């Protein structure tokens, strides 16, 4: 019942894309972490995951109390969204993302 984003160690807050790249360097596919969006706008976040030995940038949109990777937004929290994709591949959004959120980089 604790859906707090601060409570998740895969959430790193105000770190840069370069800091994310440091943490994903030489990591296995399915490695992931979330940081604040570079814009700092509408309470958005940015998911970065490892796929093909490369770092894939995925916006977490936040609008009218909900979250998701594309409209329609159907998740009530960032934690619910990320938890969902621990066990579902992201391939429906893009066939290049046939991967799960397996291995958090933890603060």
């Amino acid at each position: 019942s604790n859906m707090s984003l601060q409570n998740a160690e895969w959430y790193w807050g105000d770190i840069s894309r370069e800091e994310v790249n440091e943490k994903l360097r030489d990591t296995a596919d399915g490695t992931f972490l979330v940081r604040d969006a570079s814009t700092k706008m509408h309470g958005d976040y940015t998911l970065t995951l490892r796929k093909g030995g490369n770092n894939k940038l995925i916006k977490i949109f936040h609008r009218d109390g909900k979250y998701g990777f594309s409209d329609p937004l159907t998740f009530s929290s960032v934690v619910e969204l990320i938890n969902h994709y621990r066990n579902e591949s992201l391939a429906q959004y893009n066939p290049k993302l046939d991967v799960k959120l397996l291995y958090p980089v933890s603060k």
């Binding site: 894939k56 940038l57 995925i58 594309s70 893009n94």
Partner: peptide, 8 residues
């Protein structure tokens, strides 16, 4: 941008 395009 460098972001992934995510199907709606």
């Amino acid at each position: 941008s460098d972001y992934m395009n995510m199907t709606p």
